[PDB]
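Customer ticket, subject: "Can you confirm the structure for plastocyanin?"

Message body: Hello, I'm evaluating your service for our small team and ran a test protein. I'd like someone to confirm that this is what the system normally returns, since I don't have a reference to compare against.
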Amino acid sequence: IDVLLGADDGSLAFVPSEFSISPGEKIVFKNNAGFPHNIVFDEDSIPSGVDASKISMSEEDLLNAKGETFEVALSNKGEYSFYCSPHQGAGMVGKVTVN
Ligand SMILES: [Cu+2]
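Agent reply: Thanks for trying us out. I re-ran your input and got the following:
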């Protein structure tokens, strides 16, 4: 599943922001507009035994160019909340459910 980092109208959002995937299904986060951006999984809002470092960029890590991507596949079932560090307050957050 392809997820845009910034909307086509320049909005600071993940498109789509809420979605469900199956275990092993690739998520490709792609820089679109308003970059730099990153994708950080909230360590307190992912399956409790999951290592957020295995699936997340650090808050300092950034995707700098249009078209640059961050790819990750989630294994463990459950809800995973994530956000873009620099734009969290602006509302650039999402939630993916692995079922
Ligand atoms: Cu962002």
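A couple of notes from the result: The chain has one domain: 1-99. DSSP finds no helices and eight strands in the chain. Feel free to reply with more questions.
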